[PDB]
Amino acid sequence: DDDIAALVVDNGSGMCKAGFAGDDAPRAVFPSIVGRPRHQGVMVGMGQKDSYVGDEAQSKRGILTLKYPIEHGIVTNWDDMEKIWHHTFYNELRVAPEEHPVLLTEAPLNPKANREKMTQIMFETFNTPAMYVAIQAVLSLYASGRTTGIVMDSGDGVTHTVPIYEGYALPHAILRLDLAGRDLTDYLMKILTERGYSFTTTAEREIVRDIKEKLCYVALDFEQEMATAASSSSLEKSYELPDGQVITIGNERFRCPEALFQPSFLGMESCGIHETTFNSIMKCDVDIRKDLYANTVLSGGTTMYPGIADRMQKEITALAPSTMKIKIIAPPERKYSVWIGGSILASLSTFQQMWISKQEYDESGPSIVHRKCF
Amino acid sequence: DDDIAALVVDNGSGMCKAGFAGDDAPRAVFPSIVGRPRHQGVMVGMGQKDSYVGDEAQSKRGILTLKYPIEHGIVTNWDDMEKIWHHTFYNELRVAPEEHPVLLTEAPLNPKANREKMTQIMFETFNTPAMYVAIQAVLSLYASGRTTGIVMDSGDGVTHTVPIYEGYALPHAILRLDLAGRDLTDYLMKILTERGYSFTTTAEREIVRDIKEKLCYVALDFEQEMATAASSSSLEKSYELPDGQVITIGNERFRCPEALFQPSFLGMESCGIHETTFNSIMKCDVDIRKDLYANTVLSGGTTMYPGIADRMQKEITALAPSTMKIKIIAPPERKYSVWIGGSILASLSTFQQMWISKQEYDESGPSIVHRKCF
Amino acid sequence: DDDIAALVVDNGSGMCKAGFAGDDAPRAVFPSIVGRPRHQGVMVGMGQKDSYVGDEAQSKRGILTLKYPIEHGIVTNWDDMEKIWHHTFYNELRVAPEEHPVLLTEAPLNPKANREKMTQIMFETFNTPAMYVAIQAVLSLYASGRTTGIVMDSGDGVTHTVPIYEGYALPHAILRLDLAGRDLTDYLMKILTERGYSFTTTAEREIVRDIKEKLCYVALDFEQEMATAASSSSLEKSYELPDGQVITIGNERFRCPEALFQPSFLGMESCGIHETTFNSIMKCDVDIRKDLYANTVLSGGTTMYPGIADRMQKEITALAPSTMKIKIIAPPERKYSVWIGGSILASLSTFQQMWISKQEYDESGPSIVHRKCF
Amino acid sequence: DDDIAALVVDNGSGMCKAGFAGDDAPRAVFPSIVGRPRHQGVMVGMGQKDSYVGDEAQSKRGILTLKYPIEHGIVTNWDDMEKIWHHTFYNELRVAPEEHPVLLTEAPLNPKANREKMTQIMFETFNTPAMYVAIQAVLSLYASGRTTGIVMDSGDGVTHTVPIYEGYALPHAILRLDLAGRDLTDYLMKILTERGYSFTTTAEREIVRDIKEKLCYVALDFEQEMATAASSSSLEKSYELPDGQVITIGNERFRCPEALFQPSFLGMESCGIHETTFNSIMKCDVDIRKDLYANTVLSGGTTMYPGIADRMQKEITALAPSTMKIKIIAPPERKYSVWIGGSILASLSTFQQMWISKQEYDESGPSIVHRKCF
Ligand SMILES: Nc1ncnc2c1ncn2[C@@H]1O[C@H](COP(=O)(O)OP(=O)(O)O)[C@@H](O)[C@H]1O
Ligand SMILES: Nc1ncnc2c1ncn2[C@@H]1O[C@H](COP(=O)(O)OP(=O)(O)O)[C@@H](O)[C@H]1O
Ligand SMILES: Nc1ncnc2c1ncn2[C@@H]1O[C@H](COP(=O)(O)OP(=O)(O)O)[C@@H](O)[C@H]1O
Ligand SMILES: Nc1ncnc2c1ncn2[C@@H]1O[C@H](COP(=O)(O)OP(=O)(O)O)[C@@H](O)[C@H]1O
Ligand SMILES: [Mg+2]
Ligand SMILES: [Mg+2]
Ligand SMILES: [Mg+2]
Ligand SMILES: [Mg+2]
Structure with a gap:
């Protein structure tokens, strides 16, 4: 499938994760920052650029002012975001984003203008044949290898939950937290x-x-x-x-x-993180709550503190009734579970029919994205 | 008689009872429901069907809306009924409904269009060589082993009575109750x-x-x-x-x-159940009432409450004159007495001459059913 | 009748409506909320209370957490309810609830413990000589001035219907909706x-x-x-x-x-609101359905949206047969029709014999309410 | 004759027919039913009575249970019959049943206790100066204007025949049918x-x-x-x-x-109605049968079906010998022929000597009725 070789690129509030479908680990991980000089130069012919992206900014961080292009999962600076995407596609992965369809991720309950502008930049500045936008929590459950359970995702800007029963999502039970x-x-x-x-x-x-x-x-x-x-x-x-x-x-x-x-x-x-997880469960149907109590998946960097799983189990057991058994499933590779699930989904044979084509976008304006991708 | 092996299939307002003639208990008992998904699926390649029949719907009942194809013994949805019959004949009994004649049951005083459509589906969608429609209360008396007495049948949709003297039915005394x-x-x-x-x-x-x-x-x-x-x-x-x-x-x-x-x-x-039973007796001839008072047969699931027989005896004795002796006959296996009597009747040597042939239906249109089967 | 001056006090899921019998409009209308401070005070001698009730909480709503004592017409907090009743009787109406009998309202199909606790608080904390509990939908029909028709009431927590023919209620046709x-x-x-x-x-x-x-x-x-x-x-x-x-x-x-x-x-x-109204009509007798189709009364705050009456007429005409004529009666003062009917009923000369006396809840108890008041 | 103005009141199994002697049509015709409420009232001061008689019950028939005081021409409820008589004498005819002698009708072969109780109620509850009981079939022949022929009367409860030759009745040939x-x-x-x-x-x-x-x-x-x-x-x-x-x-x-x-x-x-009419003729003398074949009078509401007379003629001609001529006399006003004949009989000058006086009843106990009135 080299031809497609879906360039799996995730852009978390704090970090950027890019690579190729079929691999088991992201190729490039680096901070999502842009730096600009704040003093006046006296050395001549030093080759001083006007902007630094990624690890270069963290190296020489003593003379620049650092800005985050993303706040709370919502884009605020679009010139800086274009700079970061150019860095990832050319100077880090060193590939041409014209023959590989791209899969992007996004938090639930975001503004619709976000996906409209994402599609426009990808189809006009770049010439990507196809694209798809997926919810990050759904991808985490793909990596876990199960189709039942409530997933918790906590990155750098947002925290969300979404319980799904046998492949069926309950969109009325999704809860967000800043x-x-x-x-x-x-x-x-x-x-x-x-x-x-x-x-x-x-x-x-x-x-x-x-x-x-x-x-x-x-x-x-x-x-x-x-x-x-x-x-x-x-x-x-x-x-x-x-x-x-x-x-x-x-x-x-x-x-x-x-x-x-x-x-x-x-x-x-x-509410606290324990109460938010319990509140989402109680918004679901009666007959599916028992299987949700015993299938809880943790994900994201903020869930990597030592001793978080034991504390979470203690709080939820005090809330839930005594007869039910509560199990928290925190695999050792949960720091990259969102990216892992994205690679698995893009490598599926039955997924190839749901790509958004270049031809469909040209004929019908940049809104197809809202109805498509579910 | 394997060749015939009449597939005794009963379809009560609430449950379905199928099996083979000559056995003493139904092979398959399961709820008569059809379920359909009500949420939108996000997991891909999960093998999600569009309908579930029987025990599968009761298992995953937390995400579907359940519909009963039968209300008050009258069919209202015919696509759902075809689905249920297909399930019973293939996925549960695992037999071919083309060489076994089929015996069906029906409550008295139903619309005539019901039996016309039953015959048409069985002879066109399936190719059953023969069929017969019997009153459920008559079959209950077969299981009891007696030819005198008034039978009470109460299932999930209807309650009916029919008193019959020495093999002679009194159709003017049949009473129905919803x-x-x-x-x-x-x-x-x-x-x-x-x-x-x-x-x-x-x-x-x-x-x-x-x-x-x-x-x-x-x-x-x-x-x-x-x-x-x-x-x-x-x-x-x-x-x-x-x-x-x-x-x-x-x-x-x-x-x-x-x-x-x-x-x-x-x-x-x-009227109450006690008064309905007494009212049916008083509509019969004077000279046969004494034998009816001492031969009362209870049947159906709704008659399985503890202490129902003692209460019934007390009420009827207060109504009937003092000299007569009232006996209520409630065998321990009365939950399946309708099915038991059907197997006995289909295994009789003298019954084989009253089957409705395939040839008779083809020549004379789907009405023969009303005059035939008594 | 000053002596009695029945203090007509209604407590809707969202608002409280109090006044005197014989008037044409409630004297006091204010939100049913209780607020408590959530920060720590630094100014000393500011006269900061520990709780705020009603419009005072809505004024300074930027520093408190607001709680609703009533959810879905069922009481959950009893200390907060006592606080609200004390506010209405003393700081708003400025009367003494010891010589005026009180009339209260309640939604149908509520738990029985609700009325038991209502009576106990009124007779022990206060010393009210008499009380009566009335269904809110019946009071709405009193305000309309007619004794035939099906009434729709939709407030803040519940939606119910009750059709009554010439003063006769059909309790088997009452339907509730959350x-x-x-x-x-x-x-x-x-x-x-x-x-x-x-x-x-x-x-x-x-x-x-x-x-x-x-x-x-x-x-x-x-x-x-x-x-x-x-x-x-x-x-x-x-x-x-x-x-x-x-x-x-x-x-x-x-x-x-x-x-x-x-x-x-x-x-x-x-089901939708249109289908619920139609479903209630079809549960009534055949001979009274024609007069119910032409007498439909709307009530409650949620029915005050512009254009609701025209849409309701269109939906019901599509459901009902063509020959019948459907008329929706939505008076301009339907926002207070429940309170208006309560004042009319308490001012009737023939109603004075159905009050619950104080000596009866000391010779019978707070359960007298279940059998009494119909 | 105003003084007497015999109040001709007939009480057929199904309807009641009252009026004055000398008129050509009954003044009041209404159903003989009594209704009682079956629900619990919530509207106060509505003037809800406890019973409704006649057309009022048929109007508001959707909330009452209707009972017929008369079954098969035999009285079973005496309180309901007193209610119906009070309605007719006061609220419909608006006369005082104390100065007008009353003529009543009755089917042949009734129990003797019926006329004993009829006389007792009329002489004790009311103070009617005189009474007389007449067979309904004899009155029908008075309306027809002839003194020879066999009369058929079929109302709501009974069917009877009585052939009479030149004013002479043959009581051995009267036949009754339920x-x-x-x-x-x-x-x-x-x-x-x-x-x-x-x-x-x-x-x-x-x-x-x-x-x-x-x-x-x-x-x-x-x-x-x-x-x-x-x-x-x-x-x-x-x-x-x-x-x-x-x-x-x-x-x-x-x-x-x-x-x-x-x-x-x-x-x-x-037997059928045709065979019953023929059977009555064959029980008479040989020499009077020819005049009976050509004088047949039909009466009652049940004889008002279209085409009944032609069918009756065909059946009787097949039974009777060929030489005799069969004529069925069905006047257009046969629905009220029983009442018409009663008015004619009460207006006869020679009938005034056969009234039963008040004085005779007081001295000789309530049996004179059986020997008197023929
Ligand atoms: N070992 C650790 N202990 C505690 N917190 C950590 C650790 N490693 C990373 N984090 C937290 O995880 C966050 C990075 O999340 P990230 O994976 O970038 O999410 P996203 O990719 O959605 O932005 C950082 O803000 C950091 O605070
Ligand atoms: N142990 C029990 N106690 C009380 N009711 C029962 C019991 N078992 C079954 N029933 C009732 O019997 C009904 C099933 O009747 P069923 O045998 O299906 O009649 P049919 O076959 O004619 O539909 C159910 O609706 C259930 O309410
Ligand atoms: N003009 C309006 N437009 C839309 N909704 C309204 C309007 N006025 C009131 N409401 C709704 O009506 C509700 C108040 O109902 P209310 O009369 O208090 O019922 P109850 O007295 O049974 O609690 C409020 O929750 C509000 O949402
Ligand atoms: N046009 C008609 N067609 C058929 N049956 C009729 C018609 N009119 C009246 N009847 C029947 O006649 C009966 C009324 O008989 P009625 O004259 O009241 O006898 P009685 O006065 O002895 O009670 C009703 O029960 C009704 O069924
Ligand atoms: Mg993340
Ligand atoms: Mg049954
Ligand atoms: Mg209201
Ligand atoms: Mg008559």
Whole structure:
């Protein structure tokens, strides 16, 4: 199938994941950022470009201002998005996006103008023969290898759930939540100031993100952990900064991820992640709820904290009735489960009849996308 | 007689009963329902059919809308009936309906178009060599082993009686009644709302039907039972739903089956089951009434409530004169007595001359059925 | 009759309506909500209470979480209900509920524990000399001035019908439906997200409710309206939210009220409002159906959409036979017809003998209500 | 004669006929029914009575249960009969039954207790100065204007014949028959079910009675009519029910009245109407039979079917010898011939000496009636 070799490209709120259908791991993973210089140059003939995309911006991050083209899964800057797509197709995968149909992903309940503009850029700036837009949670269930269960996806901008029974989706039970990794990073920056550490710039935000994902964990019991931390001092680890200085973090290690289960720490009116998952189940039919309780799939980077699965099981068992058995299925490769399911779907023989052709778009205007792709 | 092996197939308002002549129990019993999907599928290549018949629909009943092809013993949907017959003949009995003559049953006082269409489907869609239509109450008396007595049959849609003296039927004394299991199920659903339990969907109707047939009974004295139930609390049982919740039922246990003897609870103008049985006897000749009083046969699923026979004896003795002796004959296998009598009749040597041939139908149009079969 | 001056107090799923018998309009109408603070106070001596009831909660709705004490006509919080009753009797009507008998209303087919607890609170917390519970649909027919016809009532939680012939009720024909204003509000919130507007909090729900009741209408023909809306742009209106921002609504103006006639939009198994009204008529006797077809009374807030009466007439004429004449009677004051009928009934001279006395709930108890009041 | 103004009141099994002697037509004709409410009233002060008599019951027949006080010419309910007599004397004729002697009618071969109780009610509850009981068939011959011939009377409960020669009655030749309009109505209801129309309630019985008397007729040759009806479709008429529906009747138009000549359709052992009339003639003397063959008088409502006279002539000619001439005398006003003859008899000058006085009853107990009035 080289001819098609569907270039499976995912663009998560925080990262970009591209590759080829049939493989078991993404070829390219890099941050979705665009940087621009903020000082005046004195060296002449240095070959200073006007923009840097991806890992190059993270390297020389001390002299640029970094901007995220995507906020909360909604595009706000379209010039920056075109720059990122050009980087992925030419300088990273080094392929020609004119003979490979492309499969894209999108969160549920997005504005319709998003998919209209996605199709227009792909068919006009590039000449891709076909395209299809799929819900990211459905692709996660493909990777899990099962056709029954409620899926949780939490990336960098959005958190959504969708339960589907024997291949049948219940669109009235889909719930969305605007709590993800970026809110946790801002909260950790705010609460690190009690010990005297002040991080304000965008470059300092990247430093704080690294600290969070290497030293934080979810506590099984929140109140009891505080008493142990207050009494002794064994719950302390040291981190060295990019310039060589040392910081020590105590109860902030588990106080930051706790915001997922108690959103009132940030002052937003919303339910916790455990209650949202339970609320989606209770919106389904009576006769299918038992199979949903025993098939729960976790996905996304924000679900990779240590000890999250045990805490989730404890909370849901307290909510659900005693007789039912609750099982949380968190495979070790759940960080890339969305991409894995996309490759499997594009390699199916029966899927080849649902591509959107170039001819159909030319005759009927850029709306076919809303009715098509289900 | 394998050659004939009459495929004895009964199609009661609620259930379907098929098998072979000469056996003592039906081979296949399953609900007479057809289900169709009501959501939109997202999983591809799942092998999702467009219709489910029988036990398959009851399994996955949480995503379909269930329809009954038969209401009150009168056919309303003919495509669904053809689907059910195809299921029984091929996927359940796994026989070829081309060399076995078929015996069907029908309630008295039905529209004539019913038997005309039954014959046309059997002779055109299938190629059955012969067929015969028998009254279900007559077959019940065959199973009882006697040729004198008044038979009561109450299934899911209709209730009828027919008294026959020494092999002679009195067609002027046949009485019909539109009160059966479905009316009781609707009444129980309506009266369960006083305690806060709300069942509305068709799937919830199946749940309510199971509750009714496992926890309900007929009270010997209606007024006295209410005083005992009001005073104490020993008349209470617990039931667990399909999803782990628990309901408690008090006086609703015996208030639901009571509607058979007092039809005014549903607001319909009609007599009770005891008065209907007595009314049929008084329409017969004087000299045969004494043998009818001492030979009463009960049949059908709705007559399977505990304590129904004792209550029936008490009511009829109060109506009939003191000198006569009233005996109610309710064998333990009366749930299948209609099917049992059909097998016995089809295995009789003297019955083989009354089959309707294929040749007679072809020459004389589909009306022979009305004059034939008595 | 000042002495009695029956305090006519109605408590609809969404609003509360109180006043005095003999008047032509309710004195007090205000939302049935209770609010509680959700932030921590820093100003000292501000006189900050712990709860707000009614219009005070709607004023300062930006810092509280609002809860509805009534869901689907069934009480769930009893402390909040006592708070609301205290507000109405003292701070709004400014009367003493000890010398005026009180008339309350209730939807049919409610749990019996509801009226038991209503009587206990009124006779113990307050010392009201007498009380009576009436069906809201019967009171609506009193206001219409006629004693023949089928009444439709649709408020905020329930929709019910009850046909009554010459003062005789047919309790076997009463039908209930759980589709009202709250389901429409949730659906409009869900379907407003396609244009990018996201309302999630409870305060944002009140904003969405105002938009719905000032810019929505029922289309005479659903399919044809979509073609006109797709082609031109004249079907668009602007609304200005509380911070100065403006939103534009297109086909969502008539897509929201359409859910009443096609309940499958919300994914619930039920019939439309037109089919429910027709189904109730066909459950009545043959000889009284002709007078019911020409006497149809609409009531409740949800029936106040523009163009609802014309659409209802078209649907029922297509269902009913051609010879009958269908007339829909929708008076301009049908928003308060339930309250109007209650005042008329309490002012009748022949009604004074059916009050429930105080000595009877001390010689009988709070169950007298089930047998009494019909 | 105003003073006497004999209030000629007839009470046929089905209808009541009252008026004044000397007139040529009854003043009041209305059904002999009593209705009672069967539902519970909610409207207060509606002036709902506990019983309705006559045309008022037929108007509001959709909410009552109707009972006939008379079955087969024998009184069974005496409270209902007193109610009907009170209605006729006060609310319809508006006269005082204390100064007008009353003439009543009765079928032959009734129980003696009937006339004993009739006299007691009239002399005690009312104070009528005089009474007389006459055979209805004798009064029919008075209206015909002849004193020779055999009279046939068929009303709603009984059919009787009595031949009288030159003013001399032959009481040994009187024959009675229990086949009248009510049996025909029940048979039509039973045989209408073959086309799918189900009428069961008492109100539905009145609908069926109207259909029978407006679309039924007697066929001259029964077998030949069936062949014509089977072949073509011109023998079909349409009728519109009260709620808008439309029913079509084919061979049931003449199959219902045929039961008069072939009583075996209802399964009763009896002779046909033609054979009963012939049997009465053959029980008379030889020398008076010739004048009886040429003087046959028909009377009653059941004899009003079209084509009955021609069929009767054909059957009797086949039975009687060829030389005799058979003439059937059916005047156009034979529906009221019994009442007409009663007025003529009460206006005769020579009849005034045969009244039963009030004084004779007081001295000699209520038996004088059996020996008196012949
Ligand atoms: N080891 C880890 N521990 C905790 N959080 C992590 C870890 N690795 C990644 N994350 C979180 O996952 C997020 C990245 O999600 P990503 O896979 O980019 O989602 P998407 O591709 O949909 O944008 C980061 O914001 C980071 O906070
Ligand atoms: N154990 C039981 N207790 C009470 N009711 C029962 C029981 N078993 C069956 N029934 C009733 O009998 C009905 C089934 O009747 P069925 O035998 O199908 O009649 P038919 O074959 O004529 O349709 C069901 O509707 C059910 O309500
Ligand atoms: N002008 C309007 N247009 C559309 N909907 C309205 C309008 N006015 C009121 N409503 C709806 O009617 C409902 C109020 O019903 P209400 O009269 O309180 O019933 P009840 O008294 O039984 O609670 C509100 O939820 C609102 O959505
Ligand atoms: N036009 C008609 N065709 C057929 N039957 C009729 C017609 N008119 C009246 N009848 C029958 O005659 C009966 C009325 O008989 P009626 O004169 O009341 O006898 P009586 O006065 O002795 O009760 C009704 O039951 C009805 O069935
Ligand atoms: Mg993700
Ligand atoms: Mg049965
Ligand atoms: Mg209302
Ligand atoms: Mg008569």
